[PDB]
Design an enzyme around this catalytic site. Structure first.
Site, PDB file in Angstrom:
ATOM      1  N   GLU A 189       0.851  -1.183   0.000  1.00 22.09           N
ATOM      2  CA  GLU A 189       0.000   0.000   0.000  1.00 22.09           C
ATOM      3  C   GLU A 189       0.896   1.244   0.000  1.00 22.09           C
ATOM      4  O   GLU A 189       0.548   2.259  -0.611  1.00 22.09           O
ATOM      5  CB  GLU A 189      -0.929   0.041   1.235  1.00 22.09           C
ATOM      6  CG  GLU A 189      -1.901  -1.139   1.363  1.00 22.09           C
ATOM      7  CD  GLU A 189      -2.894  -1.229   0.222  1.00 22.09           C
ATOM      8  OE1 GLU A 189      -2.990  -0.274  -0.566  1.00 22.09           O
ATOM      9  OE2 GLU A 189      -3.589  -2.258   0.125  1.00 22.09           O
ATOM     10  N   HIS A 245       1.975   1.717  -3.478  1.00 18.85           N
ATOM     11  CA  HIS A 245       0.866   2.294  -4.254  1.00 18.85           C
ATOM     12  C   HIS A 245       0.789   3.807  -3.993  1.00 18.85           C
ATOM     13  O   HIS A 245       0.699   4.622  -4.916  1.00 18.85           O
ATOM     14  CB  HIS A 245      -0.484   1.675  -3.834  1.00 18.85           C
ATOM     15  CG  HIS A 245      -0.622   0.211  -4.133  1.00 18.85           C
ATOM     16  ND1 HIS A 245      -1.722  -0.515  -3.734  1.00 18.85           N
ATOM     17  CD2 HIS A 245       0.204  -0.675  -4.744  1.00 18.85           C
ATOM     18  CE1 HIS A 245      -1.572  -1.785  -4.080  1.00 18.85           C
ATOM     19  NE2 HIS A 245      -0.412  -1.914  -4.694  1.00 18.85           N
ATOM     20  N   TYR A 292       1.741   7.476  -6.963  1.00 18.84           N
ATOM     21  CA  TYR A 292       1.056   8.694  -7.398  1.00 18.84           C
ATOM     22  C   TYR A 292       2.004   9.886  -7.294  1.00 18.84           C
ATOM     23  O   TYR A 292       1.945  10.766  -8.153  1.00 18.84           O
ATOM     24  CB  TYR A 292      -0.232   8.919  -6.603  1.00 18.84           C
ATOM     25  CG  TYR A 292      -1.219   7.800  -6.821  1.00 18.84           C
ATOM     26  CD1 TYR A 292      -1.870   7.647  -8.066  1.00 18.84           C
ATOM     27  CD2 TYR A 292      -1.473   6.866  -5.818  1.00 18.84           C
ATOM     28  CE1 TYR A 292      -2.731   6.595  -8.291  1.00 18.84           C
ATOM     29  CE2 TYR A 292      -2.351   5.786  -6.038  1.00 18.84           C
ATOM     30  CZ  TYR A 292      -2.972   5.668  -7.283  1.00 18.84           C
ATOM     31  OH  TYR A 292      -3.851   4.637  -7.532  1.00 18.84           O
ATOM     32  N   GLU A 331     -10.888  -1.588  -0.305  1.00 18.23           N
ATOM     33  CA  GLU A 331     -10.132  -2.192  -1.411  1.00 18.23           C
ATOM     34  C   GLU A 331     -10.920  -2.548  -2.660  1.00 18.23           C
ATOM     35  O   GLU A 331     -10.406  -2.421  -3.783  1.00 18.23           O
ATOM     36  CB  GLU A 331      -9.420  -3.434  -0.893  1.00 18.23           C
ATOM     37  CG  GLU A 331      -8.578  -3.012   0.267  1.00 18.23           C
ATOM     38  CD  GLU A 331      -7.522  -3.971   0.617  1.00 18.23           C
ATOM     39  OE1 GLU A 331      -7.918  -5.078   1.031  1.00 18.23           O
ATOM     40  OE2 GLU A 331      -6.314  -3.608   0.484  1.00 18.23           O
ATOM     41  N   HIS A 383      -5.993  -8.272  -2.515  1.00 16.01           N
ATOM     42  CA  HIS A 383      -6.199  -7.835  -1.134  1.00 16.01           C
ATOM     43  C   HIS A 383      -7.667  -7.984  -0.717  1.00 16.01           C
ATOM     44  O   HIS A 383      -7.965  -8.504   0.363  1.00 16.01           O
ATOM     45  CB  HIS A 383      -5.825  -6.358  -0.941  1.00 16.01           C
ATOM     46  CG  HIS A 383      -4.368  -6.070  -1.141  1.00 16.01           C
ATOM     47  ND1 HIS A 383      -3.870  -4.790  -1.166  1.00 16.01           N
ATOM     48  CD2 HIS A 383      -3.307  -6.896  -1.340  1.00 16.01           C
ATOM     49  CE1 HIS A 383      -2.565  -4.830  -1.381  1.00 16.01           C
ATOM     50  NE2 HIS A 383      -2.196  -6.094  -1.489  1.00 16.01           N
TER      51      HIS A 383
HETATM   52 FE   LIG Z   1      -3.473   0.083  -2.606  1.00 21.31          FE
HETATM   53 FE   LIG Z   2      -4.858  -2.840  -1.101  1.00 19.47          FE
END
Ligand SMILES: [Fe+3]
Ligand SMILES: [Fe+3]
Ligand SMILES: [Fe+3]
Ligand SMILES: [Fe+3]
Lengths: 296, 296
Positions: A107, A110, A114, A167, A204
């Site tokens: 996460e 992730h 960005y 999620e 997930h």
């Molecule tokens: Fe994520």
């Molecule tokens: Fe996730």
């Protein structure tokens, strides 16, 4: 009299080292293998190849991209530092605990992706304005705080429902934009990062939903019905808030109706991940083909 | 609908998304890039190529290997599922929280690596006996519970001291064995997994120690002296316990005195990472250059 004497005297059970030669639930290993084998970092994608198409995008497309991506960053920040972590104490197996540490880390990858995209394509003022907008947007803060209220609570099953809806549902009002844009030769490399993120989120949501199903089936008849009602109530609340967020992000672009169909489609998938029937009839989930096609 | 209203009314400040375009402490980015850039999984090392070497080892050598590796697995299990995680709430920056999520995950990778080694080299009874021994060994359980007592406490700085001593000192009565064996051309692929683990631990100890220093230096000279006393006091206790653990594992093989020197070498390194002078004179910490080079 050492400071830790009471702790020790009080924890007589042996602390256990994880043993991967004995797996109580094979699904944990399958997920560990899938998630770790899918490891990636945003630096592996040539986002700079998107600079020309970004500059080609309209002011409205760039504004929507900045905002949507900042909203996704916020959810990943939450899921990585609070969400996934909150599931550790209630794990059924030690291998599940290990899987959550990978989820937490990914996460953060992730969320950082960005900023890699922003730093490559956007101006500092656009970046600053996007983060400011994310702090002031009432719908984004509301979905964030509703979710964090459960992670900060003391009910293990509620944490899994909140996590699965985050999620499998809350990210989609945002994943729509890069999938749309990439079908129009815009932000195609950025879209490859989004696809790597989706490859993780789908697993997930599936996994945490699976654990929720195992936990809720360990309960009394009345309790199982209570959690089902709680899940649909939370889903309706998040959906209603998401409609507003969606209108405000896409009305100027005019993509709103298709995005709403995408919301209903993913809410049904989120509920299915938790073992429940969908909330919306299938005929209300007809997102354009170009979108589910860009997902592929 | 109503269940989260109170939490929302009590958390009026905006929830923030991490921004990697603004880094208040450059070290967080340096460490994130280093750790993620060093990503590895044990499957990348051909441990099965060590089978001939392993089969030639004596029963005493094999037993010591099973025990030290299981003790290391216990430590990584704790660090990934409890330790790194306990540092999150006390982070100075959001980027530092992201780093802890990577550390948590890699500690799970470390723990799993020993199972990969066992599952390739050892018999089932040997694995079962090793985990059983780990549950019953008083010194192993004691060092684990001492460290966990601080993770479970409410003093942020003590959590970092405990984590740094776990990473920079406790893992070491354990790395001596594979590095020494490697210098005798034994278990050389396994040693490659050990070097990947050392490359991470080195950075983890350094980083968490760095954050400990930043935090303690915000206190009065008087409070700073109390934390130094606490730190040395904890080292005396862990060192005493480790001496006994070391004698029981190594006396048979006859390597005890050299492992004790190695304990003192690492105790000094761990204190140094916390900003303090070493405990033992340099001349009491001699380590063979053939071990030091694989240590590197
Ligand atoms: Fe994520
Ligand atoms: Fe996730
Ligand atoms: Fe480790
Ligand atoms: Fe470590």
């Amino acid at each position: 009299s050492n400071e830790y004497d009471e702790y020790i005297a009080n924890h007589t059970d042996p602390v256990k080292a994880i043993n991967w030669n004995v797996i109580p639930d094979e699904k944990d290993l399958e997920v560990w293998d899938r998630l770790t084998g899918n490891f990636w970092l945003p630096e592996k994608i040539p986002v700079s190849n998107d600079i020309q198409s970004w500059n080609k995008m309209t002011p409205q497309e760039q504004l929507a991209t900045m905002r949507v991506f900042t909203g996704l960053t916020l959810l990943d920040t939450i899921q990585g530092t609070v969400g996934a972590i909150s599931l550790l104490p209630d794990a059924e197996t030690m291998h599940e605990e290990a899987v959550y540490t990978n989820i937490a880390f990914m996460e953060s990858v992730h969320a950082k992706s960005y900023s890699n995209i922003f730093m490559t394509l956007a101006s500092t003022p656009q970046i600053n304005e996007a983060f400011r907008w994310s702090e002031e947007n009432e719908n984004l803060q509301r979905k964030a705080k509703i979710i964090m209220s459960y992670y900060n609570g003391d009910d293990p099953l509620k944490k899994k429902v909140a996590s699965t809806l985050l999620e499998s549902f809350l990210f989609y009002s945002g994943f729509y934009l890069p999938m749309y844009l990439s079908s129009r030769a815009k932000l195609t490399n950025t879209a490859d990062i989004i696809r790597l993120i989706i490859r993780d989120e789908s697993v997930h949501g599936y996994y945490i939903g699976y654990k929720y199903q195992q936990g809720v089936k360990k309960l009394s008849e009345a309790e199982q019905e209570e959690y089902k009602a709680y899940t649909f109530d939370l889903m309706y609340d998040l959906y209603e808030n998401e409609i507003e967020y969606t209108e405000d992000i896409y009305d100027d672009l005019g993509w709103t109706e298709d995005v709403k169909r995408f919301l209903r489609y993913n809410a049904n998938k989120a509920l299915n991940n938790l073992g429940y029937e969908g909330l919306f009839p299938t005929d209300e989930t007809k997102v354009s083909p170009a979108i589910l096609s860009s997902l592929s």
